[PDB]
């Protein structure tokens, strides 16, 4: 049907929006600089560099997913738009 | 698999070392072959290096972060300035539909009156 | 997950692991079934090559050079800017998170 | 009609703008001298407003599609008038051919 496809588009949009927002909030979660205790400084420094790297990668992936969604919406509207089709026909 | 063998080296080597880590922990659950015994100790700090170095986590790895964010941004800003345009002109003259996942059009004079099957 | 789980299951609400004295009982110069089923197909003859392989503590030298340059970057201006910059960045970090989280209501 | 396409591509622009400005903020919050804290608030506001207006536009577009979708192939078309016009063009071409032939026979008679 058509309700399933549109609700899938809604699900994808809300999922990606909450994903990018959550990722930025966790980036600022690890952004507090504090005092260490039993954490072996260099280890968590390296793996937090690793985490922010993979999270920036997640941000880029989110942007690319939004681009794909925009392209799909562009395809969908032109093909099934009754009003747009009529104008071309009458001209 | 000639490509991605170097990553394969780094990961199988890290795998063998973390296998040795699960090995030392496998002997850590042990009271036979080895006994546990707790007594504490001390380690005086040289600096406030957690914070200091965390600030470098921002400098270094947030520079890598901001670099990759700006690198994605420059790639995209370049990219935006062709398929979906051509579909317009085609849909403006001919007659199209989408069924399944492909795009199909018609040629026959069939909506215009013919019944030639 | 694996990082954050292990990191919080270590540095909060724990008896302290950095106490333990590590003192095995004997040397097992022979192939024990204890090893092969305790460890799932590994652990060759426990010997003077794998006593230190087990109980090695010195890391690779690259991080040692990193620690040398940690001493170097501590040799720059300090004792007036370490705590000062912790204060400033902590405060404005907190302000940022407050502002961004505050407006989703 | 075309406005829909224009707004969609403008939304593309704002997507990459949000990525750029976020990268800018995180440039600022690593440098020791993060003096422009009013302008740090500026870049945070840019992040905020950008994300909301993007999500706003896409949600509105989905609702519009939810009111215009019917799942049928739309079997109108414009073929007949195009056949008629092609017929008329080749009729004119016939005329042009016969005229040239008459022209040459008159041309050859006038010349002795």
Curated annotation (Swiss-Prot), chain A:
Compartment list: Nucleus
Annotated family: Belongs to the Mediator complex subunit 22 family.
Function comment: Component of the Mediator complex, a coactivator involved in the regulated transcription of nearly all RNA polymerase II-dependent genes. Mediator functions as a bridge to convey information from gene-specific regulatory proteins to the basal RNA polymerase II transcription machinery. Mediator is recruited to promoters by direct interactions with regulatory proteins and serves as a scaffold for the assembly of a functional preinitiation complex with RNA polymerase II and the general transcription factors.
Quaternary structure and interacting proteins, as annotated: Component of the Mediator complex, which is composed of MED1, MED4, MED6, MED7, MED8, MED9, MED10, MED11, MED12, MED13, MED13L, MED14, MED15, MED16, MED17, MED18, MED19, MED20, MED21, MED22, MED23, MED24, MED25, MED26, MED27, MED29, MED30, MED31, CCNC, CDK8 and CDC2L6/CDK11. The MED12, MED13, CCNC and CDK8 subunits form a distinct module termed the CDK8 module. Mediator containing the CDK8 module is less active than Mediator lacking this module in supporting transcriptional activation.
Designated name of the protein: Mediator of RNA polymerase II transcription subunit 22
Lineage per the UniProt record: Eukaryota, Metazoa, Chordata, Craniata, Vertebrata
Gene: MED22
Region of the whole protein represented: 10 to 100 of 200
Curated annotation (Swiss-Prot), chain B:
Recorded superkingdom: Eukaryota
Protein's cellular compartments: Nucleus
Tissues and organs where the protein is expressed, per its UniProt entry: Ubiquitous.
Disulfide bond annotation, renumbered to this chain: none
Similarity comment text for this entry: Belongs to the Mediator complex subunit 17 family.
Disease as annotated in the protein's UniProt record: Microcephaly, postnatal progressive, with seizures and brain atrophy: A disorder characterized by postnatal progressive microcephaly and severe developmental retardation associated with cerebral and cerebellar atrophy. Infants manifest swallowing difficulties leading to failure to thrive, jitteriness, poor visual fixation, truncal arching, seizures. There is no acquisition of developmental milestones and patients suffer from marked spasticity and profound retardation. Progressive microcephaly becomes evident few months after birth.
Protein name, as recorded: Mediator of RNA polymerase II transcription subunit 17
Source species of the chain: Homo sapiens
Full-protein residues shown: 92 to 217 of 651
UniProtKB/Swiss-Prot annotation, chain C:
Sequence positions bearing Phosphoserine: 28
Domain of life assignment: Eukaryota
Coiled coil (UniProt feature): 79-105
Compartment(s) of residence: Nucleus
Region (Interaction with the Elongin BC complex): 88-97
Subunit structure, as described in the record: Component of the Mediator complex, which is composed of MED1, MED4, MED6, MED7, MED8, MED9, MED10, MED11, MED12, MED13, MED13L, MED14, MED15, MED16, MED17, MED18, MED19, MED20, MED21, MED22, MED23, MED24, MED25, MED26, MED27, MED29, MED30, MED31, CCNC, CDK8 and CDC2L6/CDK11. The MED12, MED13, CCNC and CDK8 subunits form a distinct module termed the CDK8 module. Mediator containing the CDK8 module is less active than Mediator lacking this module in supporting transcriptional activation.
Function: Component of the Mediator complex, a coactivator involved in the regulated transcription of nearly all RNA polymerase II-dependent genes. Mediator functions as a bridge to convey information from gene-specific regulatory proteins to the basal RNA polymerase II transcription machinery. Mediator is recruited to promoters by direct interactions with regulatory proteins and serves as a scaffold for the assembly of a functional preinitiation complex with RNA polymerase II and the general transcription factors.
Entry domain remark: The elongin BC complex binding domain is also known as BC-box with the consensus [APST]-L-x(3)-C-x(3)-[AILV].
Family membership noted in the UniProt record: Belongs to the Mediator complex subunit 8 family.
Name by which UniProt lists this protein: Mediator of RNA polymerase II transcription subunit 8
From Swiss-Prot, chain D:
Associated clinical condition: Neurodegeneration with developmental delay, early respiratory failure, myoclonic seizures, and brain abnormalities: An autosomal recessive disorder characterized by congenital microcephaly, profound global developmental delay, exaggerated startle response, refractory myoclonic seizures, progressive widespread neurodegeneration, and premature death.
Intrachain S-S bonds: none
GO BP annotations, alphabetical order: positive regulation of transcription elongation by RNA polymerase II; positive regulation of transcription initiation by RNA polymerase II; protein ubiquitination; RNA polymerase II preinitiation complex assembly
Record PANTHER family: MEDIATOR OF RNA POLYMERASE II TRANSCRIPTION SUBUNIT 11
Classification via InterPro entries: Mediator_Med11
Entry GO MF terms: transcription coregulator activity; ubiquitin protein ligase activity
The keyword Transcription regulation is annotated on this UniProt entry: yes
Lineage: Eukaryota, Metazoa, Chordata, Craniata, Vertebrata
Protein family: Belongs to the Mediator complex subunit 11 family.
Alphabetical list of Gene3D superfamilies matching this protein: 1.10.287.3490
Subcellular location: Nucleus
Keyword Coiled coil tagged: no
Keyword entries, A-Z: Acetylation, Activator, Disease variant, Epilepsy, Neurodegeneration, Nucleus, Transcription, Transcription regulation
Chain coiled-coil ranges: none
Predominant subcellular localization, coarse grouping: nucleus
Pfam family for this entry, one: Med11
GO cellular component terms listed in the entry, alphabetical order: core mediator complex; mediator complex; nucleoplasm; nucleus; ubiquitin ligase complex
Protein name: Mediator of RNA polymerase II transcription subunit 11
